[PDB]
């Protein structure tokens, strides 16, 4: 993943989240320090109950993670809750409605994210 380019990717995601010091939550939870971040954690989001409950089942953003996760996201967190034994939990949908199906856009998206992570 090439993060400079993974830069402009972000563009697409910008209309919804923001990275960086202090970076707020908007439509969607902060990004900064997401890699390795347990979903659905983010102080002061309100999350989905599919979002928070794949958190609490085990759901961390590695970037293997999040590569999988981009290309539809209701898709990767049913799989997750269900694989985990919790199924019942993986009725409900994500807020988040935008899909990158791209593989490289998403490899460069997610370097520009570790970025922002220790
Ligand atoms: C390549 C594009 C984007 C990236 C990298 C991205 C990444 C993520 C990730 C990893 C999460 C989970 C965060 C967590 O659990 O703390 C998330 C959640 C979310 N994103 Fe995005 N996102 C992108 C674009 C968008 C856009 C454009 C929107 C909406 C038009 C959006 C709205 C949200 C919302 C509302 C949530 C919370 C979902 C829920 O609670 O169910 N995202 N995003």
Same mark, same amino acid.
């Given at each position: 993943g090439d993060p400079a380019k993974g830069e402009a990717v972000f563009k697409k995601c910008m209309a919804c989240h923001r990275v960086?010091?202090?970076?707020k939550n908007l439509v969607g939870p902060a990004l900064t320090g997401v890699? %390795?971040?347990? +979903? $659905?954690?983010?102080p002061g989001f309100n999350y989905s109950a599919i979002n928070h +409950?794949? $958190?609490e089942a085990g759901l961390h953003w590695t970037p293997? !993670?999040?590569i999988a996760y981009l290309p %539809?996201? !209701?898709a990767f967190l049913r799989?997750?809750? +269900? %694989?985990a034994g919790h199924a019942e939990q993986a009725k409900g949908s994500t807020?988040?409605?935008f899909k990158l199906? %791209?593989?490289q856009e998403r490899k460069d998206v997610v370097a520009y994210l570790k970025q922002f992570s220790p």
């Amino acid at each position: 993943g090439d993060p400079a380019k993974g830069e402009a990717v972000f563009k697409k995601c910008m209309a919804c989240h923001r990275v960086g010091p202090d970076a707020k939550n908007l439509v969607g939870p902060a990004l900064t320090g997401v890699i %390795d971040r347990q +979903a $659905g954690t983010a102080p002061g989001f309100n999350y989905s109950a599919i979002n928070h +409950a794949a $958190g609490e089942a085990g759901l961390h953003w590695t970037p293997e !993670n999040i590569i999988a996760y981009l290309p %539809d996201p !209701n898709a990767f967190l049913r799989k997750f809750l +269900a %694989d985990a034994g919790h199924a019942e939990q993986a009725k409900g949908s994500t807020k988040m409605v935008f899909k990158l199906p %791209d593989e490289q856009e998403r490899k460069d998206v997610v370097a520009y994210l570790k970025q922002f992570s220790p």
